Each structure stands twice: as structure tokens, then as C-alpha cells.
Ligand binder design. Structure first.
Ligand SMILES: [Mg+2]
Lengths: 507, 446
């Protein structure tokens, strides 16, 4: 009968060198690892939205309580937690008139509807940021619910509200050349159609298409729905709130503030212990379903050092898909560039190449892409390749009572493959992390040679390092948690000329 | 000397702030005393505390709350200081702390009311900031800041009460080992006998096409009524392999290798399962990757089995507990059972819309807990058990594969201690998790 080892719960650093398991406690006791002396908030939104922000912002200054503060740390309140003050009266407002939204929103197809609205926000944001003498740390996008409702793919605006009539079918628009007739007058209607067709190239989610559009100017932003900020107000006919945060209200405040904080530019925390020179490399693909070539897909790499701030590298769009196998793999030529892109960032970052590199994905690497790596890997560098999957085939049940096994147990199949319980029960929290019985993950070293048990520890640690969400741990290592989301942002915009950019530019 | 700082904590109501405050002071370098920093088994309380304030404390702090006034224990605690006050003769020694807008002046005790307070309702950080200036004002005897003291109290005061124990235990799993295998594994040079087109998935005995041969547990004779022109086959043309020498990995060939054989058995096991399944009288549901098989309504006494419910009532729907399977060879031969929740409007009928099944499963799922799942998986296997010990999977007309209903238990080095009933609140907080599941909302839930 094979048996399970237990991996000691990892430890993240906080200011004052206190080391703690739980960021939420860790922040309150000791605060953020590095510190900044303000959050000059930029705000884009409607009149009513702006207040909701203010009303919320004020509230957070006070401490806030969840229902079970044992299973969820209570929120002392911004000033107390971060020291730095987030001031609702130190704001920059680029207003969006309701009469402007009224205009672009009531259009027949979402793509036109969504692109036009996204266009609107950026235009202020860029315009303000470029034009204004005064710097702002973070622009706060206050999303009316109507926009959220109807600016998502598959949103269907009722015909009886359509106020502008679409000029072309979704099918035909991607194949469109505006080319000039001899007669201009005709062209004026033709340019019109060219402008509409172009919107079908951009993705139809407001959140992704905006973040993506913004990458060029490197302006961080946080996107909060009006409903989220003042959830109590938006209610069903019954008068119940549509979304109820009453139980978790402090926890929400934990999330926003933290995420606000990092985007501000100070990383709250870092892993407590790491071997030096270790470089973690998140692989990301999104099949581009658009092109007449069925293998097209996008190529993304998300590097993580100890901090978990992250860095993102724009790989090249090509035939990385094999629909038969169903996985994604890389032609050698591309593989060479990414690492080159990646290590040359590391060297610039540290002035020396990392001793160790780990690459993460969910599909066993092919052999040919993999040796395209050795050909840019410097001789002194170990280069391991790790397949991580949320295999659904294995589950561990407890003989008595209703609580699962505690996170951190591990089944080591053999010296290259093992099972890790990122999910499960936490005693520190005296409750669990999923409602169903937890599902371990499967770690294999597909390519290269490295210790199994160290990498299980290596990976459990990457669970701790999610800034965007403030929580005890995430089930995936941070490398892949956001893999799709990043995928969706790259595919969202037309041209990936983007240089590698910091991770806070994607969330 | 006396440098110590006392605090009165109403309990348990104001334990949160009360907890927060002390540690911040402590890291900096201010010695502090409060009961919440010690669990007690000293038979006395009054005489370990009242004694404490007088001897060493450099200042005294109360907590103005609804249950700050109304709780007796502090009042006695303040009175000593108040009486405590006369001997020093200094008021600055005693400071109150108000944290509730709701607690009312009338409610505030008279000893309090005169007293000059620090205000926390507006913000803790501000209130606290006021205080260490007053501390600065009195020049209270306080060492330079050491927070590394503070978590060691935190890891020990709080972490200890709830933390991982060293107790070991054993864990049922979804892994059922394979009781037995047919002794030999057969390949047939049927060749001309089998047409190239033919579909070996269609076989009606588990068989897998192979590069020059067809592979099965089954005796060459077994495949007649669907594939004639086979009685022409001389059984000595059949390459046979020992079952256990594949499992041992001892087997390899110029033409074949052990991994490959292992790979092959697995597929067979899967097919062998689907086959055995139609026999069993449970209706079936096809996952896109594979099938899953579940029980229809009314086929059980009160729709239970061995007292365990397997189809019940959700809203306007009936739900059913069904399972998938696949086997593995590396690092044991076992049958892996995935669990599934499949619904029916009639209670005998599928629901067409993908998203209504999926949506339905999750909503039902939250209500369910590991004991329940274990109890349900583990009853759905004693049902298909031809014998309680195992279920017969036919792979040859006389060749069988056997699999045990007792799943393989895992040893556990480190455990925890069981809290109770907390989840249901969490579990009903999981119905309110059908909300901020937004992709445009830049948030992720627990
Ligand atoms: Mg459309």
C-alpha cells in the first residue's frame, strides 16, 4: 500500500521580515513587503458611478467584518492595513455622460456595441494621462451594469431598443476590403461600412478588449462593476439584491484594496524562502478560431521569479495547434525566440542568467520543440519541463465525518510523477477550499531531470503568490492560473507588437 | 519596575479589534499585558490579574462597547485601576478606547464618561496614531520596535489552538484494485480473416486492432457470429503473452514494449466496462469524452440502496448519482471511478440542454459533503457487485477480469481535528457564489 507525505505549508514574506502563511493576516500584522506613499486614484465612469466609488472608498477606511471572521480574516481598513491612505477626495475624474453611453450602446451587434464603448473609455484615459501634468497611479473603470450586460459575447440587445442599424452581417465582416470607388459619395457610405466591419476583429468582452487596447500605453487600471461596488442597490423584482456580499463583505474589501495596492506599484508580499536564480516560465496558448488556417493559435509566456509580480511575453501567432491530438506545441524557430526574449529579460533583470529554469504547461511537451530550448539554454543552466494537470481521475475520501483531507498531503507516484493536494481542508482556516471533495493535481517532469519532491514544494509555493486575489492560496500555481485570461487579452487586439510588460497590466 | 500595559477585553464580542491592537504595540517594543494573550488553567483569575496591574503596568486601557459596559468582568477590572488610580495619583495612566457608534454615552459608565478617550470609529490607524504620541507624551518605558516578537505570539497564541496535528489516518479512495486478470493476453494474425475497414470497437468482446494482429483477452474462437471466415484460423498462429509479465514490466519485444502493452490493456478495460454495463440495467449518459452510467427512478426501494439514497428530489427535477471509469496499470492495476450527478425531468429522461445539466449539478453539489460522496460512490459499487467482493467484467466467453468493491486505502502521516457544521453556512454561501462568477468583473472567489 503506497502512502502519503505531507508538504509543509509555504511561507510568504511581509514587511518587517515577519513570515506568515496567510497573506491576509500577514498584511494586517506587519503590512506590505514594500511600501508606497499614496494612491492618487483616476476615475472614469458616469456621475452616479463616481459617487459609488467614493461611497465605497470611504467605507473601507473603517474596519469591515465578514460573517465568519475565523474562516475569513476581518478587514482592519485601508489605512490600518497598508499605512498608505487611499483618499476618496484625492481623485481625478474624467466624466462619461449618460448621453454618450446612450449613443454608442444601442447598436445591433455586440461587436459594434462593445468596441464603440471601449473606445470611449480609453480615449479619456489616454487623453487624460498623456495630457495632464499630474500623475495618477491607477485608473478606476466604473462599469455601469447595462454596459456589462450587453457588452459581453452572446449578449443579445432587444430589437426594440436598437437605435442605430448595423450595416453588415457578422459572417461577412472579417472578409472586407474597403477599397475606393472612383466616386467619392459612394465612398462615404463605404468608409462607414469599413469602420463597422473592423469592430468584428476585436473581441467582444468589454473587460478584455479594454485591457488589451491599453497595453500600448502601459497604463494600469482596475475594472469594477457598479454592481460590485454597491451591491446592495442592484436588486431583482422581488427586491432582493442580485448579488449578496453581506456575509463576505470584508473579504471583498480585502480583495479590492490588495489588487488596488499592487497595481499602485508596490508588491504586497514575496515568498519567504527560495533557492536563488530559479526562473519559472508559464506557457499559454489560445487557439485563434478566426483564421481559415485551423491550426492558428497565439503564443504566450508568463515568467515568474520569487515575487509573483510576474512578467508577460508576447509570442508569435502561428500553427501551434494540432486538432487531432488536441494539444498545442511549438515549431522550433519560435521556441528559440521566446526563451531568448525570456532569458534576456532575466539577464537584464539580474545581470546573470538564472541557474535554474522550470517550464510549466498542461500538455506533455513534444520532443522537437523541447530541444529548440536547449539551443538557447546556456550550458550552465538546468532546464526542466513540468506537466501539471488537474486530473479528475483520482480522489481521496475520509473514512469518517464530513471534512476532506487537509491540503498539503501528497502522493508521489514515482520520482518523476506525483500528486499534490493544493485543494482541501486547512486547519489554520478551520474550513475547506471547495464545496465538492477536493481534486488533487498531477505533477510530472516531462522533459529534463530534476528532483520530484523539491518541485512539489516549488509549486505549492507558487499557489501563495496571487496578488490579484487576496486569499490563503490558489489551487493552481500562479504561472497558469491566469493562462486563459492572458490568452484572451492577446487575441483581443489587432496587433501584438507589444514589448514584454509587467503582469499588473493584464488584470 | 513597572513598564507593563494592561487592556480590558470584553469577550468574546470585541476580541477582533482587541486582538489586533496588542500585537502592533508589541512588535515596536512596548511590553503589554492582556488576558487574550494567555489561555488559563490557573484556578485563580482575579488574583493573578488585579495583582498584575498594580505591580508593573505603565498604563491602563478599556474598551467602550455595548458589551464593554454591560460585561461585569471588566468593571471589576477598571475599578482596581480607578482605585488603582489614586495611589499613582495620575489620570494619564488610564485611557479609554471607543469603537462603537452604537454604544451610547448613557450606556458608558460614569467612571468612563469623565475620562478622555481615543476615537477609533473613524479609523483604527488614526486612533492608534493618536495613542503612541500620548505614549510619547508620557515617555512610557518602551524598547525599540521588535515585531519578530509579535508573530511568535501569533503562531503560538492562535495558530496553536487550530493547527495541523501529528496524528496519522487512512483515506478511502476512488481507486479499486483489479482482483484478477485472464492469465494470457492474446494477439491474432487474423489477417485476411479481418477486413481492413472493419471496426474492432464493434466487436462485442473487447478487442483492439493492432498493426498486424488483433488483440484481446478473448480466445480466437470467440469472434464468429459477427466475423465469419475466422474458423479458418489455426490457433497456433496466435502470439500469446503472460498477463503478469506485462504488469511486471519484465516483458518487452523487438516488435513491442511493455509500456505499449500496458497502454493496450487499458483501452480494453474501458471497452470491457461499457460492455458489462448494458447487462447491469442502469441507464447511460454520454460525456463528450466518454460514457457515464446511472440508475433510473423507482428501480430501488424508496430510491435508496443499502439505506443510501441515489435518486432524490431537486426543485422540479429528479437527480441521479452516476459514474465514469477507466483503468490504469502504472503503478498498480486499478479501476478509477469518477463520480457524476445526472438529472431527469421525468426522472426517467435526460435533459437536452448541456448548460441545464451542468448548472444543475453544481447547485446540487454544494449541498453534498465528503462523507456523503464517499457513502454514495461506495454504495454504487456494492450494487454492480455480482458478488460483494467484486464485479465480473467479461472479456472472453470464459475469460474474465475481476475488480473489488473495497477500494484501496491510503496511509496518512499528518491530520487535523474536526470542526462541525460550519460548511453549511459556507455551503449556502456557495449558492450566493452563482453571482461574482464574472469574467468582466476582475475578481476570483474562493
Ligand atoms: Mg454581433
Amino acid at each position: 500500500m503506497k502512502e502519503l507525505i505531507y508538504i509543509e505549508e509555504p511561507s510568504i514574506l511581509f514587511a518587517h521580515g515577519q513570515k506568515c502563511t496567510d497573506p491576509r493576516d500577514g498584511l494586517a500584522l506587519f503590512g506590505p513587503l514594500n511600501q508606497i506613499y499614496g494612491i492618487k486614484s483616476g476615475v472614469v465612469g458616469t456621475q452616479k458611478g463616481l459617487q459609488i466609488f467614493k461611497s465605497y472608498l470611504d467605507k473601507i477606511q473603517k474596519p469591515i467584518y465578514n460573517h465568519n471572521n475565523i474562516t475569513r480574516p476581518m478587514f482592519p481598513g485601508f489605512e490600518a492595513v497598508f499605512g498608505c491612505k487611499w483618499e476618496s477626495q484625492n481623485i481625478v475624474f474624467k466624466e462619461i455622460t449618460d448621453e454618450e453611453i446612450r449613443r454608442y450602446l444601442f447598436n445591433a451587434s455586440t461587436h459594434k456595441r462593445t468596441y464603440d464603448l471601449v473606445t470611449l473609455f480609453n480615449d479619456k484615459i489616454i487623453t487624460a494621462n498623456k495630457n495632464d501634468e499630474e500623475r495618477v497611479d491607477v485608473w478606476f473603470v466604473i462599469v455601469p451594469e447595462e454596459i456589462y450586460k450587453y457588452c459581453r459575447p452572446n449578449s443579445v440587445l432587444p430589437n426594440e431598443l436598437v437605435q442605430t442599424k448595423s450595416l453588415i452581417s457578422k459572417s461577412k465582416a472579417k472578409s472586407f476590403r474597403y477599397t475606393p470607388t472612383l466616386f467619392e459619395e459612394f465612398n462615404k457610405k463605404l468608409k462607414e461600412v469599413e469602420k463597422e466591419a473592423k469592430t468584428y476583429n476585436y473581441d467582444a468582452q468589454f473587460h478584455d478588449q479594454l485591457k488589451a487596447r491599453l497595453l500600448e500605453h502601459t497604463i494600469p487600471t482596475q475594472i469594477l462593476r457598479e454592481s460590485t461596488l454597491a451591491w446592495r442597490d442592484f436588486k431583482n423584482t422581488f427586491g432582493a439584491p442580485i448579488r449578496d456580499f453581506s456575509k463576505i463583505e470584508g473579504h471583498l474589501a480585502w480583495t479590492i484594496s490588495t489588487a488596488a495596492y499592487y497595481k499602485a506599484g508596490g508588491k504586497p508580499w514575496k515568498l519567504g524562502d527560495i533557492r536563488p536564480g530559479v526562473c519559472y516560465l508559464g506557457l499559454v496558448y489560445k487557439k485563434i478560431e478566426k483564421s481559415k488556417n485551423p491550426q492558428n493559435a497565439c503564443c504566450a509566456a508568463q515568467m515568474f521569479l520569487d515575487n509573483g509580480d510576474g512578467t508577460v511575453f508576447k509570442g508569435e501567432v502561428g500553427p501551434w495547434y494540432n486538432p487531432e491530438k488536441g494539444e498545442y506545441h511549438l515549431k522550433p524557430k519560435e521556441a528559440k525566440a521566446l526563451l531568448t526574449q525570456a532569458l534576456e529579460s532575466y539577464k537584464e533583470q539580474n545581470k546573470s542568467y538564472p541557474k535554474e529554469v522550470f517550464i510549466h504547461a498542461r500538455t506533455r511537451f513534444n520532443d522537437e520543440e523541447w530541444n529548440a530550448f536547449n539551443e538557447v539554454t546556456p550550458k550552465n543552466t538546468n532546464l526542466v519541463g513540468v506537466t501539471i494537470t488537474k486530473s479528475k481521475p483520482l480522489k481521496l475520501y475520509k473514512t469518517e465525518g464530513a471534512f476532506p483531507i487537509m491540503r498539503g498531503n501528497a502522493y508521489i507516484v514515482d520520482e518523476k510523477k506525483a500528486f499534490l493536494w493544493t485543494l482541501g481542508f486547512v486547519p489554520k482556516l478551520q474550513s475547506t477550499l471547495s464545496m465538492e471533495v477536493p481534486n488533487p493535481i498531477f505533477i510530472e517532469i516531462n522533459k529534463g531531470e530534476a528532483e520530484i519532491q523539491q518541485v512539489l514544494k516549488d509549486i505549492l509555493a507558487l499557489t501563495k503568490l496571487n496578488y490579484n486575489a487576496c486569499i490563503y492560496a490558489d489551487g493552481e500555481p500562479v504561472t497558469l492560473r491566469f493562462a486563459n485570461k492572458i490568452g484572451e487579452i492577446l487575441t483581443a487586439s489587432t496587433e501584438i507588437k507589444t514589448p514584454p510588460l509587467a503582469f499588473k497590466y493584464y488584470i | 519596575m513597572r513598564n507593563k500595559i494592561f487592556i480590558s477585553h470584553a469577550t468574546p464580542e470585541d476580541d477582533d479589534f482587541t486582538r489586533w491592537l496588542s500585537l502592533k504595540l508589541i512588535g515596536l517594543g512596548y511590553e503589554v499585558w492582556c488576558d487574550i494573550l494567555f489561555l488559563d488553567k490557573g484556578v485563580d483569575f482575579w488574583s493573578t490579574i488585579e495583582k498584575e496591574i498594580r505591580e508593573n503596568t505603565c498604563k491602563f486601557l478599556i474598551v467602550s462597547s455595548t458589551a464593554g459596559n454591560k460585561r461585569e468582568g471588566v468593571l471589576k477590572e477598571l475599578a482596581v485601576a480607578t482605585k488603582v488610580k489614586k495611589h499613582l495619583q495620575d489620570d494619564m495612566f488610564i485611557i479609554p478606547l471607543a469603537i462603537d457608534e452604537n454604544l451610547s454615552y448613557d450606556d458608558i459608565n460614569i467612571e468612563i464618561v469623565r475620562l478622555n478617550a481615543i476615537d477609533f470609529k473613524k479609523s483604527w490607524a488614526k486612533g492608534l496614531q493618536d495613542l503612541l504620541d500620548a505614549f510619547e507624551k508620557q515617555n512610557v518605558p518602551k524598547k525599540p520596535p521588535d515585531h519578530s516578537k509579535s508573530n511568535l505570539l501569533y503562531q503560538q497564541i492562535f495558530l496553536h489552538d487550530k493547527q495541523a496535528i501529528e496524528k496519522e489516518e487512512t483515506y478511502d479512495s476512488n481507486w479499486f484494485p483489479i482482483i484478477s486478470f485472464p492469465n494470457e493476453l492474446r494477439f491474432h494474425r487474423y489477417d485476411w480473416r479481418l477486413p481492413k475497414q472493419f471496426d474492432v470497437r464493434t466487436l462485442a468482446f473487447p478487442a483492439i486492432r493492432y498493426k498486424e494482429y488483433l488483440c484481446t483477452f478473448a480466445w480466437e474462437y470467440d469472434f464468429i457470429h459477427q466475423l465469419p471466415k475466422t474458423e479458418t484460423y489455426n490457433g497456433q498462429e496466435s502470439i500469446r503473452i503472460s498477463t503478469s509479465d506485462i504488469l511486471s514490466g519484465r516483458y518487452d519485444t523487438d516488435f513491442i514494449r511493455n509500456y505499449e502493452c500496458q497502454r493496450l490493456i487499458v483501452q480494453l478495460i474501458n471497452k470491457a466496462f461499457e460492455l458489462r454495463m448494458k447487462d447491469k440495467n442502469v441507464r447511460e449518459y454520454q460525456m463528450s469524452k466518454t460514457f457515464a452510467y446511472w440508475i433510473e427512478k423507482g428501480k430501488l426501494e424508496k430510491d435508496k440502496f443499502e439505506k443510501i439514497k441515489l435518486v432524490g428530489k431537486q426543485k422540479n427535477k429528479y437527480w441521479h448519482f452516476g459514474i465514469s471509469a477507466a483503468g490504469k496499470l502504472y503503478p498498480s492495476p486499478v479501476l478509477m471511478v469518477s463520480s457524476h450527478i445526472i438529472f431527469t425531468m421525468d426522472g426517467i429522461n435526460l435533459i437536452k440542454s448541456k448548460s441545464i445539466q451542468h448548472s444543475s449539478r453544481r447547485k446540487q453539489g454544494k449541498n453534498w459533503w465528503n462523507d456523503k460522496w464517499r457513502e454514495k460512490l461506495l454504495a454504487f459499487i456494492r450494487f454492480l457487485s455480482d458478488d460483494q467482493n467484486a464485479i465480473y467484467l467479461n472479456v472472453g466467453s470464459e475469460e474474465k477480469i475481476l475488480i473489488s468493491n473495497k477500494p484501496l486505502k491510503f496511509f496518512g502521516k499528518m491530520s487535523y481535528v474536526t470542526p462541525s457544521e460550519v460548511t453549511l453556512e459556507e455551503e449556502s454561501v456557495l449558492a450566493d457564489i452563482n453571482n461574482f462568477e464574472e469574467d468582466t468583473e476582475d475578481l476570483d472567489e474562493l
